[PDB]
Structures are given as structure tokens and as C-alpha cells.
Design a protein around this ligand. Structure first.
Ligand SMILES: [Zn+2]
Lengths: 34, 183, 147, 104, 50
């Protein structure tokens, strides 16, 4: 869904965040976004 | 009517061209910048290019996942294989002159994930440490048996060769005027 | 050159054959030469076929043998020495003529002619097994029939 | 028919490439790559009547066609290596890419 | 057309290309019969004719 992770263009992934927050962050790359 | 004479004064310098598949050329009609190379890395006889780049800090970084998983920070390498072809000279343009030099290879830069490749090396190391459970004499080449060659033999020779950490500079007026003074 | 090789195999003769040697002790044992010249005389001594390449598991290891049985196998041509090397590497349990044919690529005539010449030179004896009978197992004259 | 859509675009290619040839006269460490036809059986980029370019790179061998044609959303940078030593310098980025093709 | 180049083009011009050229590309891919016993013996096929 246009989920490009810049500097790798790989993917994004809704990850289980702190206090249950719905953060999105991919593997194989140190990246995060609200 | 008008005519712009070109001549070919370039030798002795096997200059390469890269292609960043990650960063765009222009951003909202505005031309972008190139990121600053920390150091370069070149493998002769296999023509690889492990260009290192830094990625920016905590604000868009998420170090708490980067530190605890692979313990490798602030370094994003990207592998480029040197591919050769004919034609395709490189031209810098003078006022009513245009001066050519041959391009030796064109390598294409893909994001080489180094740290999570190596995160399974200690994981493979710890496999046989939790499960430790356990003579080199010559033989003869037989003419009814074959040996590996071609594609997979070139990967056996491209992992073990000399590292070179390149002193990356940005000069190039020495390369310019040396070409200008030669006809 | 050759005088340091006379000091090198003295260290191989210094210890009784067990407790097999390796380089990280041998560099501390002998460090008068740098490793650019230590390796060159050992490869020359591999060409003087007195040092062998033993394997302790997964890593690098050496073993030096007696000279009195090194000239024994240097009497043979390289094919007879090729079958002799595997047949002492088993040693304690023996080898089967099919296994000694597989690891060398020598086909059925050139291995059967090889050991027949080797038996006249008193270098291989033939025993029959009991854990699997009707199979030809060969050994040296060490006489180690643990089966 | 649709071949008449081609020649008018090749006219619109020359008027876009004489612009980028002329804005880069200020030698501002600017590079461009273009391909020459090898296997020869030097010359001069030159303007004809009413917007037409050609090169004649042999003694006689004319190459009429040129075209400023490709699309790349990439970063492309030229570097010169020398003898695998302290020989790493980024020369410049690449603005455009044209091609040369002989007429038949 | 049919004088220089008849009606059994497809049969005659195929076998005639096999005999002339397409035999020499066979023995050049099965040359050098060898033995492992007595390794100084070699027989090679240089060329072939019908
Ligand atoms: Zn990513």
C-alpha cells in the first residue's frame, strides 16, 4: 500500500509497539514511522 | 551552419559509472543531492563495490531495535557488480568544445543487507556449541567424472580476495586540465 | 635452510608420537624465522614427504612421522604410495577393497594390480572379519584385529 | 500516420538537446555520457537548416541521427579508479544521456 | 523459382547439410577417446568424410 521504506524501498509493517501502539516499522532496516 | 568539433583524449584511466537504484534524481522538480560516502571498498577480479553510507540518527532511526538485534549501527552498504560494455563515452563540455573519455564499466547499486546476513553467523555458530557431536589424502582425476566450474566456481573465488579501503576524495580539476592540454 | 629443517624434525622426534602437534605451539616453539620463511621450508618438507597433514576435528593440525618408515614408502611409485596412505589411515580397523577403490578413482584392474605388488613387499596382510564375514579387509603388519 | 508522430517528436528532441548543450557551456564540472557506434568501417556536432543535428566522425562516415532519449529516476556519478590504490575521487554527477545512430 | 529450387527442397537440402557440415560438428564433440589405465594412450578423430 505504497509502503516504501526509503534507502531500501523494501516494505513497511505494522508492529506491536509500546503501550500497544500501532507503529509501523520494517525488518532488515533500522527505520520507524508513526 | 554552426559546428562543434569533438576529439577523443582519454586513456590510462579506467573510470566507472554507478547507478543508485534507491535515491531519486529530482524531488518535486527540485534536483536532489548525493549522500556523503564514508568509505569505499573494491574487490579486484570480482569487481564488487561495497559503498558505505550513513543513515540519519534517532529521529528516523529506531536504534532500540537496531542495537538489540544485530548490534550494527549507522552503516548501510550497497553492492554493485561492475558490468562492462562498448560505446558510451563520458563527455564534459567546454565552450564550443566537447571532450570524450571511455567508460570502462557501469555498475548497478542494489542495497546489500550486510548485518542480518551476519546475524545468522553467530546463530549458526551457537548451533553446534549446544550440540557438539563429532584425514586429507590425495586422489586422481578420473575421465568419467566432472568437477564444478562456470557459474558456481566464480562465487567460490569472489568471497575470498583482498580488501581495499578506498581513500574517497573529491578533486577532479587535475583530471580536467590534464585532458584539456592534450589535443 | 636445511639446517633449520634438521632442527624442525628434531622437535617432531622430541615427543612420543601421540599428543599431536600444531602450529600455534610450534610458532612459540620455533620463532627464529618469520612465517614468510617458516611455511616455505615446511612446504619443501612436504616435498621431502616427511611431514603429513593429520586432521583433528574441524580445524588445522599437523603430525610428523618417523623417517625410517618414510623411506619405506618412498621406495614405491606414487600410485603404490597412494593406496598405502589410506590403508594406514584406517590402521586400527582395516579397509575394504571397495572403499579403497572409491576414494582413489583407480578402477578395478589398477587397484588389484597395485596391492598385489604391495603384498610381496610385506606391506599388507589380508584378514576376514566376523562382524561382517565374506568381506576382504586389509591391514598393515601392526596386527590390530579389534574385530 | 503514426510515423508522423515520430518525426515531430524527434524535432522536439533536438530543440530540447541544443538547450542543454548550450546551458552547459560554462564547464561547471558537468558530465554527460553518450554512445558511439563501434566497429568502424573525432567529427563535429553541427546544426543544419531549421533545427537538425548530425555528426560525421569518420573521414567520410556520416551519422545523421542523434536522440536525447531515456528516462532515469536515478543518481548517476562518475569516478576514476587507478591501479587499485589511493585513487578514489567522485568526478561529478550525470545530467543527461543521448545516443548516436548511423543512417542507412 | 522451381528451376533452380525445385519441389523437394525440404528433403534434399536437409540431408545435404548433414553430410557436408553436420558430421564434422559431431566428431569434434566426441573426440579424444581415452583410457585411465596406461595414461599415455590417446586416439583422436581429426576429420570425417562420406
Ligand atoms: Zn527498510
Amino acid at each position: 500500500m505504497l509502503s516504501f521504506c526509503p534507502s531500501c524501498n523494501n516494505m513497511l509493517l505494522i508492529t506491536s509497539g509500546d503501550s500497544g501502539v500501532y507503529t509501523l516499522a520494517c525488518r532488515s532496516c533500522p527505520y520507524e514511522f508513526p | 551552419i554552426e559546428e562543434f568539433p569533438l576529439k577523443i583524449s582519454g586513456e590510462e584511466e579506467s573510470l566507472h559509472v554507478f547507478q543508485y537504484a534507491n535515491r531519486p534524481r529530482l524531488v518535486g522538480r527540485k534536483p536532489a543531492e548525493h549522500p556523503f560516502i564514508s568509505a569505499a571498498r573494491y574487490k579486484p577480479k570480482s569487481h564488487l563495490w561495497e559503498i558505505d553510507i550513513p543513515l540519519d540518527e534517532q529521529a528516523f532511526y529506531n536504534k532500540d531495535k537496531a542495537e538489540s538485534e544485530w548490534n550494527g549501527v549507522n552503516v548501510q552498504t550497497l553492492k554493485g557488480v561492475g558490468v562492462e560494455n562498448n560505446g558510451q563515452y563520458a563527455a564534459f563540455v567546454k565552450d564550443m568544445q566537447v571532450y570524450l573519455v571511455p567508460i570502462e564499466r557501469v555498475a548497478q547499486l542494489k542495497p546489500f543487507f550486510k548485518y542480518i546476513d551476519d546475524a545468522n553467523v553467530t546463530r549458526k555458530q551457537e548451533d553446534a556449541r549446544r550440540n557438539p557431536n563429532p584425514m586429507s589424502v590425495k586422489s586422481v582425476n578420473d575421465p568419467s567424472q566432472n568437477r564444478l566450474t562456470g557459474s558456481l566456481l566464480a562465487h567460490k573465488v569472489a568471497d575470498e580476495e583482498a580488501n581495499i579501503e578506498l581513500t574517497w576524495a573529491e578533486g577532479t580539476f587535475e583530471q580536467f586540465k590534464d585532458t584539456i592540454v592534450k589535443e | 635452510l636445511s639446517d633449520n629443517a634438521k632442527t624442525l624434525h628434531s622437535q617432531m622426534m622430541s615427543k612420543g608420537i601421540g599428543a599431536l602437534f600444531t602450529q600455534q605451539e610450534l610458532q612459540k616453539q620455533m620463532g627464529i624465522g618469520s612465517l614468510t620463511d617458516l611455511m616455505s621450508i615446511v612446504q619443501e618438507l612436504l616435498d621431502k614427504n616427511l611431514i603429513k597433514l593429520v586432521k583433528q576435528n574441524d580445524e588445522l593440525k599437523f603430525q610428523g612421522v618417523l623417517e625410517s618408515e618414510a623411506q619405506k614408502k618412498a621406495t614405491m611409485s606414487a600410485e603404490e604410495a597412494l593406496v598405502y596412505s589410506y590403508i594406514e589411515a584406517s590402521g586400527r580397523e582395516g579397509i575394504w577393497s571397495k572403499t579403497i577403490k572409491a576414494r582413489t578413482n583407480l578402477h578395478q584392474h589398477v587397484v588389484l594390480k597395485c596391492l598385489k605388488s604391495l603384498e610381496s613387499q610385506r606391506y599388507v596382510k589380508s584378514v576376514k572379519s566376523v562382524k561382517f564375514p565374506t568381506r576382504k579387509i586389509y591391514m598393515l603388519y601392526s596386527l590390530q584385529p579389534s574385530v | 500516420k503514426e510515423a508522423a508522430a515520430e518525426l515531430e517528436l524527434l524535432n522536439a528532441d533536438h530543440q530540447h538537446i541544443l538547450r542543454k548543450l548550450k546551458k552547459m557551456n560554462n564547464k561547471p564540472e558537468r558530465f554527460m555520457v553518450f554512445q558511439l557506434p563501434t566497429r568502424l568501417p573525432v567529427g563535429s556536432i553541427r546544426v543544419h537548416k531549421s533545427g537538425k543535428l548530425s555528426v560525421k566522425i569518420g573521414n567520410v562516415v556520416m551519422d545523421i541521427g542523434k536522440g536525447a532519449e531515456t528516462t532515469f529516476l536515478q543518481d548517476v556519478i562518475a569516478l576514476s579508479i587507478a591501479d587499485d590504490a589511493s585513487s578514489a575521487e567522485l568526478l561529478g554527477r550525470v545530467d543527461g544521456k543521448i545516443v548516436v545512430t548511423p543512417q542507412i | 523459382f522451381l528451376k533452380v529450387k525445385g519441389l523437394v527442397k525440404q528433403h534434399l537440402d536437409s540431408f545435404n547439410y548433414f553430410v557436408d557440415t553436420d558430421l564434422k560438428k559431431i566428431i569434434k564433440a566426441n573426440q579424444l577417446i581415452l583410457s585411465d589405465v596406461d595414461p599415455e594412450f590417446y586416439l583422436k578423430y581429426v576429420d570425417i568424410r562420406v
